RNA sequence: UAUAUAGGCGUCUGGGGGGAACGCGGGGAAGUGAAACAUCUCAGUACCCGUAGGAAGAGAAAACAAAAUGUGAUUCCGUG
RNA sequence: CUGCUGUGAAUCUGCCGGGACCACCCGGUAAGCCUGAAUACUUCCCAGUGACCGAUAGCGGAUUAGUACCGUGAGGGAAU
RNA sequence: UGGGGUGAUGGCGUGCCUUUUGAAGAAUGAGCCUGCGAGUCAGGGACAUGUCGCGAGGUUAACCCGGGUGGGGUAGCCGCAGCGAAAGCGAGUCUGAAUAGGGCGUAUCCACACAAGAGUGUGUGGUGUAGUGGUGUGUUCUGGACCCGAAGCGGAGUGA
RNA sequence: CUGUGGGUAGGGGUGAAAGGCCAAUCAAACUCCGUGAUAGCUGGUUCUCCCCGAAAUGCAUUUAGGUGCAGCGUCGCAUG
RNA sequence: AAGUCCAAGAGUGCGGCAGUGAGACGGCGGGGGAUAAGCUCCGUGCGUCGAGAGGGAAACAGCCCAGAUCGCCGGCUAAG
RNA sequence: AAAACACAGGUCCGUGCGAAGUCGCAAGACGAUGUAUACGGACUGACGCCUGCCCGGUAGCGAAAUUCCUUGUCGGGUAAGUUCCGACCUGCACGAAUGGCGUAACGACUUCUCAACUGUCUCAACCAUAGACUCGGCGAAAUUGCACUACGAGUAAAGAUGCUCGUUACGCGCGGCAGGACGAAAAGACCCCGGGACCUUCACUACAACUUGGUAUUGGUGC
RNA sequence: UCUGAUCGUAUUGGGCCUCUAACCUCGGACCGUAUAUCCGGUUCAGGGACAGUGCCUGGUGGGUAGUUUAACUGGGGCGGUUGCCUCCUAAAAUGUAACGGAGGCGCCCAAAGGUUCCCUCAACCUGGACGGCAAUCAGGUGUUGAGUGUAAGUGCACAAGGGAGCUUGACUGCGAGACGGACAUGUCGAGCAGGGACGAAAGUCGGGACUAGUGAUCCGGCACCUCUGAGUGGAAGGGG
């Protein structure tokens, strides 16, 4: 009389590491994910696993193109 | 075994360069394939040893 | 009595000339075949000890 | 037996033992540490044995060094 | 460098060491050798000293003290 | 304004310590008093915090001499530089077949240029960098190491 | 059954055998020494006040009542 | 953007010297349990006790009010 | 104190003799001033029984004494009768071709039934003595945080003399009882955790206890 | 000195059998010695080149010894579990426990990796001998369904799914910048060498749709190196 269950995997701590309207460096990570959840939209590479990094700096938003939620980065007007 | 980890060695250097796995069953003869070797500084053809 | 210096981190652990105590990465040893060369690469060379640990190892490099 | 030996007998000179530490030679633990434990450590320690001497071996380099115009009988101390 | 076991080198064109070897070499001449004083320690004796103790301290012992007492014994062991 | 006791009566009031989520606790220890009883010391030990001397220097160890605590004693140690596994330079170095691309170092801080907005670099000038020996206290190291306590282990002996 | 005198001694003795007995102690006697054994476990750790002031969590652990690191407490930096 | 303005005794980094790593209950969101436990295991810029006296809950760590620098023959209130 | 050990008897194994086996590093010793009718070790534990077609074959026998027997059914024994005693019982059984059954005698062994006996009891009463109790003398002890130390129902570390609200209670003794003081005693033996010890073993690793090479040691021939 | 037999002298290390001289005998006699089952010596007798005890060496070895024999755990044991990945619990960031609820694992793929290009049915009818719940098939729409190396979030007729060519992104070797997560782990822009695809057309695309498919350090290998080389003209004896 025991339990078959007990096991599970680390918590992988995916999810959005930058969000709306933050300001990145280029090739920083802006979303750890399983799969495109988001996609790669302007000036943002998508990783081998999923992971959405900015390609420029700039400030972080989130889009929708033909109904996919995409991750961008809007260049920042220089000070 | 199954799938050993073989060693690609080039041809001309002859530099046991890379090392991968390769099932014996399905590639039971010796894996030449192009590779780069970096003694030589250009692709090379490597076979396992 | 001499405080005498920890042997296994005498020869794991290195200061650089500003004091940063260095040391190498594990997992770099054999079972290479199925770890990328990126990753390798990731392990390659030194890096400074953590701030967590630089109180220990400070430690047994002195005495 | 061959005696040409072991033993026996007389005489003389010495040894026995004790001593707190130190010395030399030899035998040699386990608590303990390794956060277990056997290698290892403890430790050649405790203890034991034999032997001194006033101090105790070597010793007058099968020595070190490194191309130096190198040091030069032996022991202890400090460094390294 | 060294214990035991076995096997076992000539005479300086020798042999040994420099942490293999031709050797460029260097150093030294073991085993048959032996032999010196100059450094540790304090039972005991003398003279001293102390930001040491001062009678539950300081030696166990300022007093019968290794006594009384306990133990078969090794041994333990005061108080005053 | 004062100044000690004795305490009818009223209100409030659940010992101390340890250890616990929590004890007055019917959990531990203490009958009482007096005396004793527990972070101490060694070492140029190690790591951090005031003073002498510098000016890049600080120091001596053993030892010698002094009737002392004083004077000598440079051996060595630490600073003086780094990067490298080492060979190599020098604010450079290592990785690099690849004046191709990076880490570790050149105290720090100013100004002027050229590259840059991938966020700051590359040069040029200017201030010139501060470690070291005593003793400062707290930790720590090797020693029993704040103090007390096993059952048991070993050596040598004593006991029928 | 007993007196006297003997012998067997500790991983040893003796045991018509109970781990019984071996000096009121035995699944390895006692004494001294190693030794102030060791114990992540109990216990104790002694004057005061001023300022600040937790934790009982995470990870790892021959780990779970221990410990390392992190989290959380305690002077000087930068910061306004 | 301001607000906190004789700063929160704030955050961060580096060295402090730590102990803490047995938590408890209560409210909310849940797991295990029988949607029992003063049960057990989680989450909660949730509280309190731990480490918190004072008032109320008759008494009554965790509830409610409220955070004790000390005095006063003062006043106003909190929960009740 | 026994059903355990021992025992007389038995069987097996070892030992050809400074035997074997033991105490010792060895010498040496006991064995034993014994010699296979003797010593040592092992295991049984007087004494009696335990073979069926061939012990040429299925092959270990199939009877009996064999009581797990829960065997119930029945009885005997009590009014209700445990231990136990009988037949019927129980099917391939089941457990003993030598380990199972019997066994007179014996037993401070375990269990039961009788006769006798009784204060064991119905069910207790009385007597004496030693205490207890009283007086005189001497005079401790464990324990002890305290103290002018109630009860109830509560509350609390969940079982309260100490807290709450009530109830009761004049102060101090003496002789008794033993419900509580989670009474004293022994830092729970149980349980768990940490350590230890000793024991076992086809746990690990060692060591004590035997073979190989060459030393001691080695001459030829017939080979 | 070979293409190179062949016999002979001494040496030679084993095996059988031997006698004696080492060695052995708790067998006898004698002696030291008056005393003596000691001891030693002499001698005879017997083992008698036979056996032996050191050194070396395998093997057996609870006979003895030192030790080990985990933890979690609604006490402990028993049972179960221990690392990694996925989901839920988990209270819409992250993270979050239980011996909570479910599963996977720890491989596999040289063509299931890279690149370039292209696609296209999940179900009714008519049917399609056999061949209905199915063929090779043909049409329509089912509108993005459907199905799709191995469980959640993704990927679709913008295909991460399905076919094809290349000849080996099978993209490897040197990798500023950033980062996400204590060590460990994980992401990639980008620069250089060399290549692979696509070329006209661009100059573009760093193992697998992604998260498991693993094990630190120590110690040892094995290949290569412009390192070291215990005095060296120098090498052998360690490192990268």
Request: glycine content about 6%; hydrophobic content about 45%; charged content about 20%.
């Given at each position: 009389s025991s339990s078959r269950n007990g096991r599970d995997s680390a918590a992988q701590?995916?999810?959005v590491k930058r969000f709306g309207g933050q300001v990145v460096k280029a090739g920083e990570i802006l979303v750890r994910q399983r799969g495109t959840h988001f996609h790669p939209g302007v000036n943002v590479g998508r990783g081998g696993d999923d992971t959405?990094?900015?390609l420029a700096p700039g400030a972080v938003e989130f889009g929708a193109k033909r109904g996919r939620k995409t991750v961008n980065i809007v260049?920042?007007?220089?000070? | 075994d199954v799938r050993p980890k073989i060693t690609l060695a080039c041809e001309?250097?002859?530099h046991r360069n890379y090392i991968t796995k390769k099932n014996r069953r399905n590639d039971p003869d010796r894996l030449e394939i192009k590779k780069?070797?970096?003694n030589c500084g250009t692709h090379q053809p490597h076979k396992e040893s | 009595p001499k405080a005498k210096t920890h042997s296994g981190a005498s020869k794991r652990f290195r200061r650089t000339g500003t004091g940063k105590i260095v040391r190498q990465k594990a997992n770099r040893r054999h079972l290479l075949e199925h770890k990328p060369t990126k990753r390798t690469r990731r392990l390659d060379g030194r890096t400074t000890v953590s701030a967590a640990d630089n109180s220990r190892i400070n430690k047994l490099l002195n005495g």
């Open positions: 701590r995916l999810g959405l990094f900015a260049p920042v007007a220089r000070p | 001309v250097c002859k780069f070797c970096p | -």
